[PDB]
């Protein structure tokens, strides 16, 4: 699923974008940096849940 | 415990600061955060492990 996201996608958008994101003013080059989060987060899916 | 009221609750300097390591909000975002009014902020500092 996709966490972080520039501004609210309008309705019926799809994002599949990779690029990571960044929570702050600093910039973010390459593929990492300070406080870069990558904006695809996996699923916690247990039967135990 | 600390309480703190009456006051401008200014994060830019905290944020943008590198000196720090981890920092994480569970409820609420620093972007939203400068227009977010808030009643009264409690700071309890403690050191541990």
Partial sequence: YRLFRKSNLKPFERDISTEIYQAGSTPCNGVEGFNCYFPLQSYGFQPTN | ?49
């Fill in chain 2, 1 to 49: 415990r600390k309480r703190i009221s009456n006051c401008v609750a200014d994060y830019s300097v905290l944020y943008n600061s590198a000196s720090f390591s981890t920092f994480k909000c569970y409820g609420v975002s620093p972007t939203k955060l400068n227009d977010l009014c808030f009643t009264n902020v409690y700071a309890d500092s403690f050191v541990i492990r």
